């Protein structure tokens, strides 16, 4: 019969002044609503992003049209079909206020929102044919991708004279176009390649996918530009952009307008032909009108000592903003090529929008969210004194030094595994020839496009710049997310214990510090923005940017989980932003999306791809799940989670244990492959569980691999304590390791196995299978949680030997916590808190503060916390979160 319930969704921070339609997620309790038999209303457009094991809705997405009316909150009421099929009430059926239509043929696809009409060719070298406003007025055309590169690089500036450079230009070439059409929003996904326009023959390269989100009643289009780096040693990217033509034919030069966003809400306001600050005044109204971007009165009405001499007032065709560092931008204009540029008063951080158009012809604004943070970038207006202007956003500026992704070192004469692991001992880098390659990394950039029937106010531009740099987000309530249990059971809301309250303040301290380090230490850049470093250098007073494994962190010890669970518990905007940016880096730049190592990611190093440990614990899709669902099934992360389903194939091309393994095994063709049951498997399982939850094109496969491998672990005599296994890539089964073919019993322990998502995947896995869980899997998992830090005797009693090199006791305290909850054992719960307060990691009497450093010790002033590293704070914070969720009933108890 009838089942209905409601969920409220809030703006992430302050109520916005403007939105351009938004998408959000909502979770639903297990078994409550069936897919396709469930209606949603707002106080609404809807689809499923995930499902529970019995096929009931786990997560949905929802979309709202652009609207002047903006609420403090929004309530979605779900209703089963039963609610309408049981009432005999007549009820009205009307068309929505606004609604998208799409016309679709051989040549091209067109999307009309009511406020713009945009065309997408199905082939060719032009992504957007044109953009019309309501009236039918074309305001921009031939949107296209640009790429520029060079064949080599001089050793230094002096070497230019003796080291010639061959420049090439490329075009975005379309191969496929897709549509996910709905009434309230429509998504055009465009896939392609870059092909040569100018320079020597060059194979097509730099695969792209560009996603356009259009919303009903919106002239604002959001653009997810994703590219994959398939260059070689010889391909140096020089320039990477998005370019539109803006037709100005018909606008008097003095009615053509140029705007750049400046610093903090600022706007640069100029005309192609400037009527202000001349020796003679055409009239106050006329000057005011030009600064306002309005069409000027008829030339007969001006003071005539100006209209007669327009011939003598220069015309400014080209404009260039370049932000080549995180801290300063240049701005210049010129009459036309063959003349010098004139410099313009500039400043620190440009907020990343430019507009070209006119009072009568209309025009177009383009921008990059997070502009200066993703340097080096730029904005160019070109040929604004012609019939056709060009507006270009540069995702990578040619005014920068070229992008060099080659190895930072030659290998220092390391010749083989023995030399490599010896170098591991001093810099923490695990180098190997040919492993230090950026081949297959990706980066996604969030772009916005704004159409205008006419040059808009500067207040409007500033307001859209702010929109672009802080996209409004609607999220469900933490309490609700928790209650549904649709994003794990291992966290909970913030208890009256004064101890618990000092834990909360400590997580807040950790977050605040990590947030400030991003600014202080300038972790900004085209590729770097979003990641942070690993360990600190207390003497130099810097993070170890230049020492092997101590530099970029690359999700080591699961900081992605701490920061995401920290958002879930709290609803903090800063917390969401920190995490979002993290996830946009980690999941794109730190992982390979093509080639033999597709679906692995790279271990922490000096470059994001320098190290030879290529492992699924970096690609670990559990790190993206929380964002996948909260964003409303963000499609690019969507795509990324699918790529990872090919991770299991890697183990035939690469053994992560190749240099340390003692059992003589190597991959060989058509053979069982070796992978770890902790680190690697937790990566695999997470990707399969997610495909299962999504009921995507490989879900039956995913279900089978997960179930079979789970069952395989259950069947190992020592379960998780075994360490690894041999997987069959054809039968999708998991048998014992090469040293234990009879399954007599094997023991191989690693401090790393639990701390890259294992407890999280396993518990979710367990809840998902329910009564179909293979016999003895929960017990094997409990065995590991309990014996990890039981006594040496107890370990020896169960498995034949004590556990040698167990560390990360704080980190693993959460496993005892989990088992304590599940066995209802108070003594075990007390163990969990003891390992938290009185083993390793961050001890409760650690300094727990920042020291300020300045003067001649350091380049710029900095706050430091030398007493911690990222490994510590990630696991400390997970421990806090998970110990509170499982064993807070036992916390006060511990404290007495």
Ligand X SMILES: C[C@@H]1O[C@@H](O)[C@H](O[C@H]2OC(C(=O)O)=C[C@H](O)[C@H]2O)[C@H](O)[C@H]1O
Binding mask 408-447 for ligand X (x = CB under 6 A): ----------------x-----x-----------------
160 part of the interface to a second copy, by CB under 8 A: yes
Q: What are phi and psi of 565, to 5 degrees?
A: -65, -30
Please state whether beta strands 362-368 and 353-358 pair in parallel, antiparallel, or not at all (unpaired): antiparallel
Nearby residues of 654 by Cβ (< 8 Å), 6 or more positions away: 596, 597, 600, 614, 667
Residue closer to Ca ion (CB basis): 219 or 551 = 551
User: CA triplet 587, 549, 852: central angle to 5 degrees?
Assistant: 95
Subset of 70-129 contacting a second copy (CB under 8 A): none
Side-chain half-sphere exposure of 512, counting CA atoms within 13 A:
10
660 part of the interface to ligand X, by CB under 6 A: yes
The stretch among 122-130, 391-399, 652-660, 662-670 that binds ligand X (CB under 6 A) is 652-660
Tell me how many residues contact ligand X (CB under 6 A). 9
State the binding partner of 750 from a second copy, Ca ion, ligand X, none, CB within 5 to 8 A by kind: none
The minimum distance between CB 805 and ligand X, in angstroms, equals 8
3-class state of residue 823 by DSSP: helix
**Of 336, 515, 661, 798, the one binding a second copy by CB under 8 A:** 336
Nearby residues of 340 by Cβ (< 8 Å), 6 or more positions away: 334
Q: How many residues are given for the chain?
A: 896
Residue closer to a second copy (CB basis): 462 or 868 = 462
Subset of 666-725 contacting a second copy (CB under 8 A): none
Binding mask 519-548 for a second copy (x = CB under 8 A): --xxx-x--x------xxxxxx-xxxxxxx
657 part of the interface to ligand X, by CB under 6 A: yes
| Cα–Cα distance list, 425 to 78, 419, 428, 679, 808 (Å) | 58, 10, 6, 21, 19
Distance CA 431, CA 613 (A): 8
Q: Are 725 and 674 in contact (CB under 8 A)?
A: yes
Subset of 592-651 contacting a second copy (CB under 8 A): 606-607
**String of DSSP letters for 505-555:** HHHHHHHHHHHHHHHHTT--STTTBTB-BS-EETTTTEE-TTSGGGSB-TT
Residue closer to Ca ion (CB basis): 405 or 820 = 405
Residue closer to ligand X (CB basis): 157 or 312 = 312
554 part of the interface to Ca ion, by CB under 5 A: yes
Residue closer to ligand X (CB basis): 273 or 612 = 612
Nearby residues of 722 by Cβ (< 8 Å), 6 or more positions away: 677, 716, 736, 737, 740, 746, 747, 748
Subset of 720-759 contacting Ca ion (CB under 5 A): none
Nearby residues of 577 by Cβ (< 8 Å), 6 or more positions away: none
202 part of the interface to a second copy, by CB under 8 A: no
Residue closer to ligand X (CB basis): 657 or 717 = 657
Residue closer to a second copy (CB basis): 282 or 601 = 282
**In sequence order, which ranges of 248-323 are alpha helices (DSSP H)?**
284-291, 304-307
The minimum distance between CB 321 and a second copy, in angstroms, equals 10
Residue closer to ligand X (CB basis): 557 or 885 = 557
Tokens of 659: 């240099």
List b or e across 768-803, with b for residues whose CB sees 16 or more CB atoms inside 10 angstroms.
bbeeebbeebbebbbbbbbbbbbeeeebeeebeebb
The minimum distance between CB 585 and Ca ion, in angstroms, equals 6
The minimum distance between CB 77 and a second copy, in angstroms, equals 40
The stretch among 115-123, 280-288, 510-518, 655-663 that binds ligand X (CB under 6 A) is 655-663
Q: Are 67 and 81 in contact (CB under 8 A)?
A: no
Identify the DSSP state of 597: T
Distance CA 665, CA 474 (A): 51
The minimum distance between CB 344 and a second copy, in angstroms, equals 7
**Would you tell me how many other CB atoms lie within 10 Å of the CB of residue 410?**
9
390 part of the interface to Ca ion, by CB under 5 A: no
The minimum distance between CB 807 and ligand X, in angstroms, equals 9
**Of 4, 125, 181, 325, the one binding a second copy by CB under 8 A:** 325
Distance CA 140, CA 123 (A): 19
**Of 410, 415, 418, 772, the one binding a second copy by CB under 8 A:** 410
Identify the DSSP state of 219: S
Residue closer to a second copy (CB basis): 414 or 707 = 414
Binding mask 140-159 for a second copy (x = CB under 8 A): ------x-x------xxxxx
3-class state of residue 17 by DSSP: coil
Q: Are 710 and 774 in contact (CB under 8 A)?
A: yes
Binding mask 546-585 for ligand X (x = CB under 6 A): ---x------------------------------------
Subset of 721-760 contacting ligand X (CB under 6 A): 752
Residue whose pair of structure tokens reads 């997970």 in the numeric block? 878
State the binding partner of 529 from a second copy, Ca ion, ligand X, none, CB within 5 to 8 A by kind: none
Distance CA 751, CA 872 (A): 14
State the binding partner of 608 from ligand X, a second copy, Ca ion, none, CB within 5 to 8 A by kind: Ca ion
Query: Residue 166 burial by CB count (10 A; 0-12/13-18/19+): exposed, middle or buried?
Result: exposed
Q: Give the residue from 788, 875, 876, 869 showing the smallest Cα distance to 557.
A: 875
Distance CA 335, CA 262 (A): 22
Tell me how many residues contact a second copy (CB under 8 A). 129
State the binding partner of 104 from a second copy, ligand X, Ca ion, none, CB within 5 to 8 A by kind: none
Distance CA 251, CA 257 (A): 10
Residue closer to a second copy (CB basis): 137 or 287 = 287
Residue closer to a second copy (CB basis): 326 or 637 = 326
State the binding partner of 528 from ligand X, a second copy, Ca ion, none, CB within 5 to 8 A by kind: a second copy
| Cα–Cα distance list, 452 to 131, 218, 520, 707, 852 (Å) | 10, 11, 38, 54, 48
The stretch among 121-129, 135-143, 420-428, 685-693 that binds a second copy (CB under 8 A) is 420-428
608 part of the interface to Ca ion, by CB under 5 A: yes
Residue closer to a second copy (CB basis): 159 or 791 = 159
Residue closer to ligand X (CB basis): 549 or 687 = 549
**Of 37, 104, 198, 700, the one binding a second copy by CB under 8 A:** 198
Subset of 447-486 contacting a second copy (CB under 8 A): 457-459, 461-462
613 part of the interface to ligand X, by CB under 6 A: yes
The minimum distance between CB 585 and a second copy, in angstroms, equals 15
Q: Are 320 and 341 in contact (CB under 8 A)?
A: yes
656 part of the interface to ligand X, by CB under 6 A: yes
Side-chain half-sphere exposure of 275, counting CA atoms within 13 A:
33
The minimum distance between CB 428 and ligand X, in angstroms, equals 7
Strands (E), 69-182: 73-80, 101-104, 108-112, 116-121, 128-133, 138-150, 167-181
Distance CA 675, CA 656 (A): 8
Subset of 203-222 contacting a second copy (CB under 8 A): none
**Of 82, 314, 494, 735, the one binding a second copy by CB under 8 A:** 314
CA dihedral defined by 287, 290, 291, 293, rounded to 10 degrees? 160
Subset of 842-871 contacting a second copy (CB under 8 A): 854-861
**Of 235, 351, 590, 783, the one binding Ca ion by CB under 5 A:** 590
**Of 373, 460, 603, 703, the one binding ligand X by CB under 6 A:** 603
Which residues in this chain contact ligand X in the complex, by CB under 6 A?
424, 430, 549, 603, 613, 656-657, 660, 752
Chain contacts with Ca ion (rule: CB under 5 A): 531, 552, 554, 590, 608
């Amino acid at each position: 019969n009838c089942t209905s319930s409601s969920a409220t969704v809030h703006w992430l921070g302050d109520k916005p002044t403007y939105h351009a339609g938004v998408t959000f997620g909502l979770p639903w309790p297990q078994g409550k609503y069936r897919p396709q038999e469930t209606s949603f209303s707002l106080t609404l457009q809807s689809w499923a992003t995930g499902y529970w094991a019995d096929g009931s809705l786990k997560w949905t997405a929802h979309a709202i049209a652009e609207s002047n009316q903006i609420y403090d909150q929004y309530t979605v009421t779900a209703s089963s079909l039963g609610c309408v099929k049981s009432s005999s009430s007549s009820s009205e059926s009307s068309a929505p206020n606004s609604s998208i239509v799409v016309t679709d043929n051989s040549d091209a696809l067109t999307v009309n929102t009511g406020e713009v009409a945009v065309s997408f060719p199905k082939g060719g070298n032009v992504i957007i044919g044109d953009i019309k406003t309501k009236s039918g007025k074309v305001i921009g055309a031939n949107g296209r991708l640009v790429l520029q590169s060079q064949d080599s690089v001089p050793d230094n500036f002096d070497n230019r004279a003796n080291s010639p450079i061959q420049y090439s230009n490329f075009d975005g070439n379309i191969n496929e176009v897709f549509v996910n059409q709905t009434s309230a929003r429509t998504l055009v996904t465009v896939r392609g390649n870059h092909t040569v326009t100018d320079g020597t023959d060059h194979d097509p390269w730099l695969p792209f996918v560009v996603r356009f989100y259009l919303y009903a009643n919106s002239a604002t289009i959001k653009v997810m530009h994703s590219i994959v780096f398939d260059g070689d040693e010889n391909d140096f990217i020089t320039g990477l952009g998005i370019r539109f033509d803006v037709p100005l034919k018909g606008e008097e030069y003095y009615d053509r307008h140029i705007r750049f966003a400046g610093v903090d809400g600022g706007i640069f306001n100029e005309a192609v032909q400037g009527i202000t600050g001349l020796r003679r005044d055409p009239g106050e109204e006329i000057r005011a009108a030009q600064f306002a971007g309005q069409k000027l009165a008829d030339t007969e009405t001006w003071e005539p000592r100006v209209s007669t001499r327009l011939k003598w007032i220069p015309t400014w065709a080209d404009y260039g903003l370049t932000q080549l560092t995180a801290d300063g931008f240049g701005l210049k204009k010129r009459t036309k090529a063959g003349q010098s540029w004139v410099n313009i008063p500039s400043g620190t951080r440009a907020e990343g929008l430019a507009y070209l158009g006119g009072a009568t012809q209309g025009g177009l604004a383009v921008g990059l969210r997070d502009f200066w943070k993703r340097y080096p970038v730029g904005l160019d207006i070109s040929n604004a004194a012609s019939d056709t202007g060009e507006l270009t956003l540069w995702l990578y500026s040619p005014a920068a030094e070229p992008l060099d992704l080659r190895p930072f070192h030659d290998g220092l004469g390391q010749d083989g595994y023995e030399d490599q692991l010896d170098a591991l001992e001093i810099t923490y880098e695990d180098w190997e020839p040919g492993f230090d390659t950026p081949y297959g990394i990706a980066r996604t950039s969030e772009v916005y496009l704004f159409a205008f029937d006419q040059t808009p106010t500067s207040d409007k531009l500033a307001s859209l710049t702010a929109y672009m740099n802080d996209p409004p987000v609607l999220v469900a309530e933490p309490k609700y997310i928790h209650e549904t249990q649709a994003l794990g059971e291992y966290w909970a809301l913030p208890s009256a214990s004064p101890a618990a309250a000092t834990l909360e303040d400590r997580l807040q301290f950790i977050f605040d510090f990590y947030k400030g380090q991003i600014e202080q230490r300038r972790w900004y850049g085209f590729l770097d923005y979003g990641d942070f470093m690993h360990t600190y250098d207390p003497d130099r007073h810097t993070w170890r940017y230049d020492v092997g494994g101590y530099a970029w962190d690359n999700s080591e010890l699961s900081p992605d989980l701490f920061f995401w669970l920290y958002f879930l518990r709290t609803g903090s905007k800063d917390a969401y932003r920190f995490a979002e940016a993290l996830t946009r880096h980690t999941g794109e730049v730190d992982v390979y999306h093509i080639g033999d190592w597709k679906g692995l990611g790279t271990r922490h190093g000096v470059q994001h791809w320098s190290d030879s440990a290529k492992q699924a614990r970096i690609s670990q899709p559990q790190y993206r799940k929380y964002f996948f669902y909260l964003s409303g099934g963000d499609e690019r992360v969507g795509e990324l989670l699918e790529e990872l389903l090919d991770t299991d194939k890697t183990y035939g091309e690469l053994d992560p244990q190749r240099k340390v393994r003692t059992d003589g095994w190597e991959p060989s063709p058509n053979s069982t492959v070796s992978f770890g049951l902790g680190t690697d498997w937790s990566g695999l399982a997470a990707g399969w569980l997610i495909e299962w939850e999504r009921r995507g094109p490989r879900w039956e496969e995913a279900k089978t691999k997960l179930t079979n491998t789970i069952a395989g672990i259950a069947n190992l005599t020592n379960g998780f304590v075994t360490g690894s296994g041999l997987y069959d890539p054809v039968t999708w089964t998991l048998g014992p390791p090469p040293s234990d073919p009879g399954n007599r019993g094997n023991v191989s322990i690693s401090h790393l196995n639990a701390v890259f998502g294992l407890p999280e995947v396993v518990s979710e896995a367990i809840a998902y299978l329910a009564d179909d869980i293979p016999k003895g899997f929960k017990q094997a998992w409990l065995d590991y949680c309990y014996y990890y830090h039981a006594s040496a005797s107890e370990q020896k009693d169960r498995y034949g030997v004590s556990f040698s090199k167990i560390s990360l006791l704080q980190a693993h305290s959460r496993l005892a916590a989990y088992a304590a909850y599940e066995t209802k054992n108070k003594t075990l719960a007390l163990r969990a808190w003891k390992d938290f307060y009185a083993s390793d990691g961050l001890l409760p009497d650690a300094p727990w503060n920042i020291t300020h450093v300045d003067g001649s010790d350091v380049l710029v002033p900095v706050d430091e916390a030398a007493w911690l590293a990222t490994n510590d704070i990630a696991q400390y914070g997970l421990a806090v979160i998970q110990n509170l969720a499982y064993v807070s009933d036992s916390l006060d108890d511990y404290q007495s």
